[PDB]
Design an enzyme around this catalytic site. Structure first.
Site, mmCIF file in Angstrom:
data_model
loop_
_atom_site.group_PDB
_atom_site.id
_atom_site.type_symbol
_atom_site.label_atom_id
_atom_site.label_comp_id
_atom_site.label_asym_id
_atom_site.label_seq_id
_atom_site.Cartn_x
_atom_site.Cartn_y
_atom_site.Cartn_z
ATOM 1 N N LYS A 2 0.812 -1.212 0.000
ATOM 2 C CA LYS A 2 0.000 0.000 0.000
ATOM 3 C C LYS A 2 0.848 1.266 0.000
ATOM 4 O O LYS A 2 0.417 2.285 -0.545
ATOM 5 C CB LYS A 2 -1.001 -0.021 1.156
ATOM 6 N N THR A 3 2.044 1.236 0.584
ATOM 7 C CA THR A 3 2.936 2.387 0.477
ATOM 8 C C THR A 3 3.300 2.643 -0.978
ATOM 9 O O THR A 3 3.281 3.784 -1.447
ATOM 10 C CB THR A 3 4.197 2.168 1.310
ATOM 11 N N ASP A 49 1.081 6.931 7.791
ATOM 12 C CA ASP A 49 1.069 5.511 8.099
ATOM 13 C C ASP A 49 0.604 5.247 9.531
ATOM 14 O O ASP A 49 0.806 6.063 10.432
ATOM 15 C CB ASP A 49 2.463 4.924 7.884
ATOM 16 N N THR A 62 -3.930 -1.118 9.536
ATOM 17 C CA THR A 62 -4.204 -2.549 9.528
ATOM 18 C C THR A 62 -5.656 -2.871 9.846
ATOM 19 O O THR A 62 -6.203 -3.837 9.305
ATOM 20 C CB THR A 62 -3.306 -3.261 10.537
ATOM 21 N N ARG A 104 7.103 -8.688 -0.042
ATOM 22 C CA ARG A 104 8.247 -8.321 0.788
ATOM 23 C C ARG A 104 9.096 -9.534 1.143
ATOM 24 O O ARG A 104 10.328 -9.490 1.064
ATOM 25 C CB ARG A 104 7.774 -7.612 2.053
#
Ligand code: AGS
Ligand code: ADP
Ligand code: ADP
Ligand code: MG
Ligand code: MG
Ligand code: MG
Ligand code: MG
Lengths: 48, 313, 309, 312, 312, 312, 312
Positions: G47-48, G92, G141, G200
């Site tokens: 999402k970043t 964030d 989240t 990731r």
DNA sequence: CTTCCTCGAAGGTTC
DNA sequence: GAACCTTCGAGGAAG
């Protein structure tokens, strides 16, 4: 000898002393010919 | 004076006392200073006195200070300049020293020299300071809060422990001779049993008993007088104060041992929350008379058989 | 004067008063100073009054200060420098001294010297023999190393009816009011065991007698005055009576929660818990339970209801 | 003026009013200051108003301040030391003073002196500052928030009580003469019975009814206008507001009177749990419309006959 | 602009508008400041908008601030020194102010004065500040968090209500004109039925449908385009989300309507226990799809016909 | 110094050491910096030593600090700005630094740049500072306490573990030779057995045993002397320390072997739960002295027979 | 760098891309900013990166900060004062922001203005700051953890999910192209199988495998080499982590299979509860390793056969 | 550093 | 045994 005088003042500040008081404390030392180590060493000894 | 001056008279602490003697002699068999030493224990066990004795046995001067008095690095470095080779530096409350000084003390202990850096960073130069050898002795009530890098530098550790009846009795016998009173060994043992293992408390009880023995008697502490004195003072034979008995009695009689909350107990005996939590409750936990639970305090079987009440799970 | 000056005038506190006499007499016989004394306990029992008696019995002049006033080490150092041999220093509300001030006080008590740094310069002082006296309501708030240095601990207790009856008569003579023995007794029952409360009721009853009567207190005038103040024969207030009545008549004696009861009497929760419940639980009218609080058999008999197990 | 100035004008509070009269008269016969007084109780019953009346009856000047404005001992010491013999010091919302400041009053109230630090260095000294006789008066809603040693020093305690329909009707009539309006004795009683027992609420209803009478009416308050105005505000003849009625109705028509939990009931009225328990439920319980039990809230017989249902 | 500016533009809230009009008219006839007013109710119903409308109708400038912006008494005292005669002060989110500052308003609202400490500190005294007439307007979502003495001082209470389908349809049409879009009256009713009675939700859906209609369409919101866009957003014709549909379907297929406990249902839907109770269940109860009972919650007949299953 | 400088000198940790070699040599082939590495495990296992070896293998300058030593972003910015291309930064107890510091470490580790705001009020600026290539090496005793978003930035993990008798005997011999001390293969085996599997303790004991042999012996460490010296130091034959002996003895005498909670135990004996949980419980579990149960820790029969208490 | 820069490069998340394409394109016909967007889902899904792509498509700069970094209101005001027209602000972990700070965004987001107290002492004054148009982007989240008034202000919501095996395979092939390396399709598929559907993790394992193939192999990645490299790491033959093995072991051995609450479990494994709730539990459920019940989590028989126990 | 307040527990009732 | 509801006690983080 002005370098050693400035060095001793800066070294005393690096010990946490204030710039104004550190200048006075080092300026209060009489012998200019002694090395920066002695200048800082003498200032700390006098501050006790 | 009430402070021992040599290992000849420092009663008890045999485990720590025996170790230090061997290390101090090994240092004397060489032209070396003693290793840096750290003393652990609860308050009032003799930590300060042991530091003075160490200096006398070494035969060297002693410098006294406390961590809070050292507010900047210049103070420590200045104090270090007042030291002669082999001098002992004693710092109490070392856990309260400021973080900015701690990181420099490492070099003094391990290297005996200090370096200071000056300049903006583009141009920079150092100064080197060489220090005489010395031994640092630290005293603290809490070991865990000392950082691991500092902990690694201390080469000797000594746990202080509570004195037992055979040793605490002797302290009473000794102290009774500094005053002008004769005390029977049976009476001295009755005081020792109620002193909670702390020398400072045994001295305080003896002083009060002495006052009674010279006003309500012929100036002699016999077993009969000791019972009467320990009857005016309400100290139980287990060392419980008057209020300690009232707390346990209340929990057993009205709450069946609990669980009961701290607030409900406080209003029953007419005491402050802070006072019950910090003055009386801490010693009752060590003796195992009560326990703290998610639902409140609870009395143990040890309390039932001591107060003399029948028990029920 | 309203404050007694000698032990022959100080009524009650037999335990604390008996101990203090022994230690004071012994100190005189040895020509030594008195050991450090800490007085603590509930409000209004005599802590401040006892400190002044000790000074007169020793035959010394009392120096007086208070914890809230001493804000920094320089203040305390100046105060200590005025002490002479045998003087007594009394610090009221000692629990308020800042931690920095307490640290300086450790060595002054144990070694009679001060060695502290304070344009700054060093100061070293070596004090004469002196006695520190402290009074507090929150002794649990003092530091543990400080408490260990006091040598005499005096814990105060509530008074009995024969003691308070005599206190009321003593105060009545100062006001030159005439009071009968049974009238003084009727005030004692209501004074909750506290001398200050006993004096407060007498002051209010005097005002009534001087306006609604002939300025004389008798068993008849006292009944009228106490009926106007609305204080029960057990010392319960109008609100205390309302609490018990509500619990017995609406919940069958409980259990009931604090919030439910507070809303039913139109009172703030914190006021009921901190201002009214403490005396009801201590006298045995209410009990606290895991599921609430309940009225005991004593409450039924006092209020006049039929108890049922 | 809107606030009464003497006991002649102060309606109700017979218990507190009768007590204060005797103590004030006795103090004057002895030519001495009045004892310290603490006034406490529910909001809007007249605590502030009484504090001024006390000063007028004593015939002395009143100095006023508040707890929130006193932040440190230096401030309090400056308010003191400016008092003259017999002055009255009134502190409103006294429970807000810092605890470190309350402990300065302990000596002032009992012995009329305070401790002060003065000088510098070796010249510093502590001396007694001696105050003239004075009377401290405090007003608070949260008496349980004061320290136990402080409450013990107040010599007179005044606990305020709610009013009743005769006294509230007289208050409504008095206020109706400060404004220039005529009100029929029947209309006044109709507003008083809906004011929940509190003078501030009675004055608020009158102000709202006035705005209607001079916009939707001829400028006079009569039985006809009062009924219409109260119907617009939607206040039941028992004082129950729109949301108060919705609570009782929902308990009878969906849960058969209960028991029901607060969470269940809140969701059915679209109100959040924290408002129902703090705004609406308190008055309904005190007046006997709702009963709290271990199983939940229950509607009483009184609620059934008020809403018009059958108590089967 | 989206926000209405006068009572003639503020659609709905008939009960609140009628009262404010009467009080504002009476205030002007007497040429006096309006009484303090508190607006409260559910989120997004139009509280902040109504505060500006009151200022425009009174014909005065509005001073605006917020609860969280005020942190100490020195801030509030500074603001009150700026008020001119007749000024209106609007404090949004008033429930956030700290209790130490909230208690300073008590005197300003009742008597228009404040007690302040002044002087260098060596010499200082308490003095009154005297404020000109002003009107405080407060808006809050959690009226129950305000202290009892504060709520008692507000003279006008405005409780906001949800909007009905006829009124909400007009808001959609009005907003379309501001966006320069064209919308069919049948489509406006489709959005209004899905907007959960809330103006903010109706505007959010319209904005998304508008963007869609100009990217894959001819720039007109017809009845056919609207259905495609609302399907992309996954908004049921009753305004239910997919999560809500999952809840209702589970109760019918695995429990035959219940009763079922909240703990058991949460596991069978893979949703968080408290999230279900706080975020989704409230609307389902208010619409009548689910009913709570002493034994558990049950799906009503309305939930069967909406899902197409057979009721029994 | 006693600590080794190269992987040939670093004894043990075959698993961690074998992995690091591959990653260190691969980075040289590509002529680029090493990925960030996190070392975790009990204290005294060689985490600090390992960081120096990595720096020497890379041929790079090492900079050092600690978690508690950093208090504000400006502190860390200075350290980072002083880096030179390839420098390694080692941060001890990285789990203790403040949340406000970690803000900047994310941006640095991920993309080598930072954005620091400066100025206030009318002054407000931000400096975008590019950072040269660098490698961060972190060390902690608690892995589960490290912030989740931070733990994701580390690319290499090294789990340290206890040493065995063959390695410890080699370490003990090596250390004695540095002091030029003479020890036989018999005595060295006793110290290794009785040093809790940890090199820091083994070196700490050797210095103390030396003093005893220099007085109660002829300067030669005999096996008979080592046993007498270790017993004089209060070190059990199983290497258990003062704290270890006090834990088990307290469980057996006051709790009948348990079960007992970690907090309760740590409160009876004056010890910090973080110390007991970090240095003592992990060792006691691996060697079977303590077992974990749903109700807490329980002492096994081995503990009973070792301490000399008759099993129930 | 590995980070994609345009929607053509961003693999997967088809649903999110399809919606954002329409809204981003529509917002370019008009010369105005995009509505506030909210992204939520598991960590590490990308999402970043999505925030960077939106900024590149809109043609504006991206500023970055985080929830925990904004400790007090004066921090946020400084950030807002530094935005250029059309900039994007990405916050964030917005759910972890202090409550009193969140209450300031309510005005900035809805009306582009804030009311702030500026100065000190006599300079204390209120200033109405007007902000230029901007687009806020939030990432969290948990959706059910924002307040209702904040969640109601976001115009666009985006939910993100784990990537399927065909998508991750293409992501590995792309990343293995930025690094000049050669990988066979069997290795790419075998590697993706281990990466928990999270890009990731895939990139981290690919880098480690590349180091091994360059030192212990022929410089080419083949299925035989991938198994060896992954076996040297702690990655299981089906992607389970050592932490997962730790979790399952404790459930089966210390609690008898469950049910057990995560509160007691977290303290026994010594892990922060948030990590197991967000990073581990969701995967173990979505793959059948753990099963959930009313009382808590329970291990399925599939877990027993994997850890080597007997499902008696 | 202190007040406040919310998380987790368990006792009791009905079906 | 499943589901609701009320009351209490010890943490812990927001003034
Ligand atoms: N072994 C001992 N023999 C005789 N008296 C002892 C002994 N240990 C302590 N004392 C007495 O205990 C008193 C207090 O000793 P300290 O040295 O203050 O103990 P402490 O550990 O320093 O307590 P602190 O520092 O206040 S926490 C001394 O004045 C001695 O009279
Ligand atoms: N593998 C090893 N080889 C040689 N010496 C070691 C080894 N591991 C630890 N040591 C020694 O023990 C001590 C370990 O301290 P340190 O590395 O700081 O441990 P930690 O960093 O885990 O606290 C040092 O004196 C070091 O020389
Ligand atoms: N669809 C994708 N295609 C290519 N790379 C991706 C994709 N999604 C994520 N990544 C990469 O994986 C990592 C994801 O990190 P990030 O976007 O910060 O995840 P989060 O923001 O959830 O922590 C980055 O290195 C990013 O370049
Ligand atoms: Mg000491
Ligand atoms: Mg007193
Ligand atoms: Mg008032
Ligand atoms: Mg609003």
């Amino acid at each position: 000898s002005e370098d050693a005088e400035q060095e001793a003042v800066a070294a005393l500040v690096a010990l946490g002393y204030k710039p104004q008081e550190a200048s006075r404390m080092v300026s209060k030392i009489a012998r200019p010919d002694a090395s920066s180590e002695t200048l800082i060493r003498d200032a700390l000894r006098a501050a006790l | 004076t009430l402070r021992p001056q040599y290992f000849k008279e420092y009663i008890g602490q045999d485990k720590v006392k025996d170790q230090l003697k061997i290390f101090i002699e090994a240092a004397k068999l060489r032209d070396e200073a003693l290793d840096h030493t750290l003393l652990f224990g609860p308050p009032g066990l003799g930590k300060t006195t042991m530091a003075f004795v160490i200096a006398n046995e070494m035969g060297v001067n002693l410098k006294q200070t406390s961590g809070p008095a050292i507010e900047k690095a210049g103070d420590l470095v200045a104090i270090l300049n007042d030291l002669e080779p082999g001098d002992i530096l004693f710092i109490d409350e070392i856990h309260r020293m400021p973080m900015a000084v701690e990181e420099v003390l490492y070099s003094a202990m391990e290297d005996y020299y200090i370096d200071i850096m000056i300049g903006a960073g583009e141009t920079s130069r150092s100064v080197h300071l060489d220090l005489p050898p010395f031994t640092l002795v630290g005293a603290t009530t809490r070991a865990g809060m000392l950082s691991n890098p500092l902990r690694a530098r201390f080469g000797i550790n000594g746990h202080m422990e509570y004195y037992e009846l055979p040793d605490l009795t002797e302290i009473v016998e000794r102290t009774s001779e500094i005053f002008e009173m004769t005390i029977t060994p049976e009476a001295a043992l009755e005081l020792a049993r109620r002193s909670r293992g702390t020398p400072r408390i045994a001295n305080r009880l003896l002083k009060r008993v002495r006052d009674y023995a010279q006003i309500m008697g012929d100036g002699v502490i016999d077993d009969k007088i000791a019972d009467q004195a320990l009857t005016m003072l309400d100290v139980d034979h287990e060392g419980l104060d008057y209020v300690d008995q009232k707390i346990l009695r209340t929990m057993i009689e009205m709450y069946g041992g609990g669980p009961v909350g701290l607030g409900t107990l406080s209003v029953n005996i007419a005491e402050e929350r802070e006072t019950v939590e910090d003055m009386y409750e801490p010693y009752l936990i060590q003796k195992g008379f009560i326990m703290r639970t998610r639902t409140g305090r609870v009395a143990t079987a040890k309390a039932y058989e001591h107060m003399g009440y029948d028990y029920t799970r």
